[PDB]
């Protein structure tokens, strides 16, 4: 109800650099209304952290810059396909409290096998393109 913005993350060489990703990789810091607002970031685990999500790709949104007070915001994660359309969208039904270095997301965001399927067309040119949509309320 205060500020709604988005960020697109393109991860090049998803399968080619799967060994070079490691446990977790984080995107560049992003923020809209830069002079007014605060820095965000996107974290993704190519392989899940635990046995429950070992066959899934986990995606999280984390607050980087120290805010003046508690931050509450909703988020919506989706995967852009070959034609640039949103697919497998997953959004938090309610908002969640954010502090510096705190993250929120989905452990089972997408099945890792469904992602690698050539039929789904999710990885063109070996590139996973993610789309985040934050709605900060204050």
């Amino acid at each position: 109800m205060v500020v709604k913005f988005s960020y697109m993350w393109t991860i090049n060489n998803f399968s080619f650099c799967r060994e070079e990703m490691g446990e977790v990789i984080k995107s560049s810091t992003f923020s809209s209304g830069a002079n007014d607002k605060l820095k965000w970031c996107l974290r993704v685990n190519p392989k899940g952290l635990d046995e429950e999500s070992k066959d899934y790709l986990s995606l999280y949104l984390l607050l980087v810059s120290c805010p003046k007070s508690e931050v509450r915001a909703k988020f919506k994660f989706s995967i852009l396909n070959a034609k640039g359309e949103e697919t497998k969208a997953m959004e938090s039904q309610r908002a969640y409290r954010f502090v510096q270095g705190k993250d929120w997301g989905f452990k089972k965001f997408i099945r890792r096998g469904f992602l690698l399927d050539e039929a789904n067309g999710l990885l063109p040119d070996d590139k996973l393109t993610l789309f985040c949509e934050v709605s900060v309320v204050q």
Partner: peptide, 9 residues
């Protein structure tokens, strides 16, 4: 949509 979690748990 889907269950939400954190990576601090």
């Amino acid at each position: 949509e889907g269950t939400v979690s954190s990576s601090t748990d």
